[PDB]
């Protein structure tokens, strides 16, 4: 299994790069970068296979710049982005660009690619990655609300002072302000959340709202997430090359399989194997639920046809 | 068990800290750094839970500044280290003493896993400022430098390699314990010597490579293991009769610490080479605990 | 953390053992057995001791017949049996007398499993005799229900369900809490009630199935991973103002034991028929404690 | 994968069974054994399927007695064997009847079977399994010495105080008092255990001779090894099916690539993979090494003639 991650050299793709090349699935992590940047991608190799032998696990740590160093990748994991007088579309604009400049053509040389997008607006630039290579609509996913639903995790796991593994939770939507918590699909223990002691004494306004700001306020203070992006990552990526077909909240291609929407990349639970999205799950959201999602999805659909308008 | 990273704002520190949390003895991780750094702490805390729920791990992050923040702890990590070589020596002295002076008189049982550099002349200084017993004051030098050497021998999992004395030009690698079944290695030496260096210029240091074997060590001393490992541990004479100098030697490391220095039997042109390294490094040191004074 | 196996000689005790010592936070596993069955233990110690070898795990096995062979563990699993049912319940009580009577003067801070049958009415005695605190002391009983309850609607790892009551003919499957998302139940729940019977008759008696959910909840309790298990604990008017009666519920389980005994929302139907298991218990209870008098 | 084991209903079949449904390469176990023992493994059944209930993992448990049975696993563990005024000869006849019944021809209906024979004497039976199945020399190995070898590895490990997984030694030959303990190849925590203070107090003549009762004086007091072998066997299998190419101490065929001998199953250094036994390492054994070695292949060879005349 080869796993080429698009942005090594960045805090991301280099936290990702390092922990993908410990999981026994992956045989070769490539690390891509620009050209200028490759000298330094050559002291995260040497840096990575240290970690690999303290860790006793045996990986190819290899380096490249170009088209042929990753299309015959098993996984393609895009990381790489311009950082944050910059609004919302001007960075889709130009991180588009890098979709179309690394991802454009590649089912023509490897149609059974896997490519998972990181890059925000993930929702967004998952459709991007998803026209410009032509792969099939179930070899294109994207981080999405992945990474808010551990987020989210984590203050309910807090709040009861239980495992963070006990908890199970799920949020659908875009990886943005509006984002759906599907409170009916959360539970501690197995138990619905609902039920249990202490859930009154929960607010889930205050949790939901530092979830969605949780993305800035890391970025204003540590600099940007790194290792909770690297481990979900990671996870994705183990659940493909493995062939778990377990469900995981991730930026999807929806074909009408939830309320008949279609035509929008968005975070939804899709059941993930090494044939990519097996299949989306219908989920019994509640009335507020489908309809926030509802909102959401116009969101993400205006979003994405401003940002094809502009990579014509 | 509770494991307090001193510098974890920093490349090595924050990278140690996510991947210590993860460890399932490690049930509460302190990220320690300077008063100016809170805010990057309350972000790294952030991330990290993030990874662990991500990872279906679980730690208690906690965030601190002061002494009773993390003299409470059960494995205090030492990765605080300013960006001469003898200025950044007395420098980065100044660091250990002001975190570690006196740690043993408000927890005797307190272990300290020194990676600042020069890790061998500073394990010496936080095993003397702090006052812990000799077995509870370890440093992570030529550990690394064998991770290095054994992908080299790897190219040319299942090679085990072990490398001796300082984390430095001095370093002498033990091939009478070099087994893939015991085995130009002179310049495989050249190149473990100067891929720290090398990764400096590049990445900008080393980062996932030490922070693994940090993982690894503390691992090995709260689930009490007793791993023969390479780290630089004080001497009392069970090599050669060398005392009173902390350098990288074999020692069986369990929850207690050091629980024995184990003497390797080293050929002759390796033992020469020992003693030649333990000079360099007594007098680094002296000048180090100089300059503290 | 040491963990004493009393009755590692039995089915349940020995493969418990075995799956014990592979946990990393398992340091030793002391067996405990009776006087003339030390060489059974001598045998089962050589041979765990390999499997750990395989493994690449540790722990240090010791054996033992007495009270200072295993009052000293953290935690200490009651798996020793005799092969009607009050006779049964009768004798069992006075085996967890003789085993555990007093061990709160002893060793304040230990924590005790029972696996013995009547599980709810013994995880009460050894309370008792042992004199510990009242989260000190829990049982295996209707999570093992679960287990069995989860692989038929599994068949119907992402199956989630809860069983709670006694581990007998009055456990209240709690359906309200049975999720894959929330959800003949009549016919699997009378399969569950027979699942022991029948490997009795079969194989001869339940053995992977506990020792497995053993080392889970020693696992949850070493590690304080604090996790929402359905163990027999002790009632104080957690759970509609019962008290005074050990029996199957949904407790946060740490290295403190139980921490709290959650109190889940069920529904009417499912709180009479918790009411009702709770009488049969009590009266069970009543009837071992009289005669362990 | 599916992996079946005849004679589950047996100390080490029952305990390996259970810890092999553990292995996420192991997607079905199937219990084998006579038909009137059938109601017997109804029992074990359910309480694996329990113990994978509670560790979470996904696995089918089948149960058979029948070559269609267990003719198609990936891998068959031969763990059937008689009970112990019984000669070594007359068991190891009545073991090789048991051998061919469940065995023989099982390459017609299935070439790429892997069979890992636990029966005792299992370098005799390895050999007769090999023949009467018809299948590849690399597709059929024993477990030999590898047990062996995890017995010795507890000496030295309890006798230097480290961690078991810090020792890694080496015993070939038979399984039996003809054994080979290689200390050429031994070490502790990657150190030549020669160079190990402490080697000159460690009386090897009585930690090799323990290793060598050790399996009679376990039947005497517990009745039999278990999970010892239990776990041995999983290792095995989890290596094969994970193709992990790694050497580890089997009983396989000899076809010369030790000191020339030939026509031999017993306990050597081979590299196992998905296709079973990729090659047999060539050891620098030391002069005495050399010389004990061939006096076992010497009994062996021995054994196994006398065997393989009884089966005709
Ligand atoms: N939940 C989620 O989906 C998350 C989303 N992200 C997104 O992932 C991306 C990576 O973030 P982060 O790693 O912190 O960013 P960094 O700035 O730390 O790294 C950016 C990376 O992109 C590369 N890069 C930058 N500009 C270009 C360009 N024009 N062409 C090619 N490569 C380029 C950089 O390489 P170089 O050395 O050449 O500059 C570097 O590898 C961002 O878009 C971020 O928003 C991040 C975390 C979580
Ligand atoms: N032993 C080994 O094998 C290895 C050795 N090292 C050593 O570990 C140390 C850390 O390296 P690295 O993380 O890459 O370096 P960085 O510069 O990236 O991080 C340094 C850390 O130390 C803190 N720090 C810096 N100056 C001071 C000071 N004067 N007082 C207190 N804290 C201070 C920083 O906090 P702030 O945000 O406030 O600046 C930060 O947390 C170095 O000394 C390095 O040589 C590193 C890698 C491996
Ligand atoms: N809670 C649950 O879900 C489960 C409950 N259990 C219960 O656990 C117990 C053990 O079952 P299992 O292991 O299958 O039974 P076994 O008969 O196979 O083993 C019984 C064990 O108890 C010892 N023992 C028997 N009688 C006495 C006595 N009078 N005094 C002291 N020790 C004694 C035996 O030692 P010796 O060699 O000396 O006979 C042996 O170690 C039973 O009471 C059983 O009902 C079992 C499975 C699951
Ligand atoms: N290092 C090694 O290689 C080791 C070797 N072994 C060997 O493994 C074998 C199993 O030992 P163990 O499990 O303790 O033995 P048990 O007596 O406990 O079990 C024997 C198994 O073989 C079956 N069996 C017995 N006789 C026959 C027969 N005539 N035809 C078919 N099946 C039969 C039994 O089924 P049923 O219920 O029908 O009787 C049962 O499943 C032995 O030959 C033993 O020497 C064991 C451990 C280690
Ligand atoms: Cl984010
Ligand atoms: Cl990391
Ligand atoms: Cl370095
Ligand atoms: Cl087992
Ligand atoms: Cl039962
Ligand atoms: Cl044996
Ligand atoms: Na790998
Ligand atoms: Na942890
Ligand atoms: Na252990
Ligand atoms: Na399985």
Request: charged share 25%.
């Amino acid at each position: 299994s080869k796993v080429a991650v698009i942005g090594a050299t960045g805090r991301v793709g280099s936290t990702a790069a390092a922990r993908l090349a410990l999981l026994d699935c992956v045989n070769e992590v490539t690390l891509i970068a620009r050209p200028k940047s490759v000298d330094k991608l050559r002291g995260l190799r040497r840096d990575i296979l240290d970690s690999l032998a303290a860790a006793q696990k045996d990986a190819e740590i290899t380096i490249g710049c170009e088209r042929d160093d990753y299309v015959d990748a098993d996984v393609i994991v895009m990381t790489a982005g311009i950082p944050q007088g910059q609004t919302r579309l001007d960075l889709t604009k130009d991180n588009a660009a890098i979709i179309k400049k690394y991802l454009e053509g590649v089912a023509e040389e490897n149609p059974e690619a896997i490519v998972l997008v990181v890059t925000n607006p993930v929702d967004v630039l998952t459709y991007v990655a998803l026209k410009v290579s032509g792969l099939p609509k179930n070899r294109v996913i994207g981080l999405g609300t992945h990474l808010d639903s551990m987020r989210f995790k984590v203050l309910i796991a807090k709040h009861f002072n239980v495992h963070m593994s006990e908890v199970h939770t799920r949020i659908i939507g875009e990886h943005g302000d509006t984002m759906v918590p599907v409170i009916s699909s959360t539970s501690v223990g197995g138990i619905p959340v609902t039920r249990m002691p202490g859930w009154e004494d929960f607010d889930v306004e205050e949790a939901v709202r530092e979830v969605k700001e949780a993305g800035q306020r890391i970025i204003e203070t540590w600099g940007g997430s790194q290792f909770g992006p690297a481990q979900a990552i990671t996870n994705l990526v183990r659940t493909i090359l493995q062939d778990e077909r377990r469900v995981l909240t991730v930026s999807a291609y929806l074909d009408g399989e939830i309320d008949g929407i279609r035509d929008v990349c968005i975070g939804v639970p899709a059941r993930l194997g090494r044939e990519g999205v097996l299949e989306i799950v219908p989920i019994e959201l509640e009335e507020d639920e489908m309809r926030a999602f509802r909102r959401s999805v116009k969101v993400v659909k205006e979003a994405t046809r401003e940002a094809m308008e502009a990579i014509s």
